[PDB]
Design a protein around this ligand. Sequence first.
Ligand code: HEM
Length: 289
Amino acid sequence: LVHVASVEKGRSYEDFQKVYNAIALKLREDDEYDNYIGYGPVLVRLAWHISGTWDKHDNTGGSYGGTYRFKKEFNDPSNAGLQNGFKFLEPIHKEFPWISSGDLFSLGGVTAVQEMQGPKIPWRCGRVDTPEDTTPDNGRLPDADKDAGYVRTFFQRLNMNDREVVALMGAHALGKTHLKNSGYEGGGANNVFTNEFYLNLLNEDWKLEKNDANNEQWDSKSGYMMLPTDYSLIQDPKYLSIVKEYANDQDKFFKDFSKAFEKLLENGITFPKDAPSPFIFKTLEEQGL
Ligand code: HEM
């Protein structure tokens, strides 16, 4: 099973920067969402969930097909709450109807990271919408109530190693959990991309509590929370080494995150040798907009 990237006809860097700008301007304008967190974090989560269905064994799932637009995937209980991100992007899809669904969902993630003062993330175009029968079945996204061994094994399906896993998990500095979506609550209200996830893991006094959905989570008096899968990063000696590395080197964390997130968004896609190089988009701030 081969998914070959095909550039939207006649489109170049300037077309995709226009789409980035549209997303970025709406992120700035629709700022009230989720108690003034804004849509940044949910767009990062959406980019990850549409990519995180991939299976390296048979090349099914992944971002290429834009299959989240179909009912089976849209209604996956693992995707509860992502409808808010889809609704955000819908007017963008209408203004730029030539962009494929997988390109738009993945670009929404890149735009959100960058606009939240995260690292630059190189991005490639050419995902092509595939039909409804290519939609992966539910149950390919990870459970939160598990341990390190589970996390490690899970991410092997996505061809991610320990360092890639720990770097990706730093996105849990962003946004929050919502009881009605996942059965976890809390986490604060952060919408600036930093390495604080690692600092918080190492420095907070964590307590194992049960929430109103009868699930266990780790809570601190500062108002932060860790999922069991988050906390497992300090229980496993290989993960703990990497947590310490990112807690002590913001730049290293940004660079490793950028590479792992690009890889996540590109898994399953074959880029022809003559494809355009990856694009690095300017932020609104860089453009003076
Ligand atoms: C073992 C892997 C993972 C598990 C079990 C996991 C689980 C969760 C759960 C339960 C929530 C709360 C959803 C809600 O209640 O709204 C969440 C939020 C989030 N996750 Fe993950 N996650 C994992 C990996 C990742 C990765 C790899 C990324 C991105 C690189 C990511 C980015 C986010 C973001 C940005 C939010 C906040 C969304 C919002 O504020 O609406 N997560 N995660």
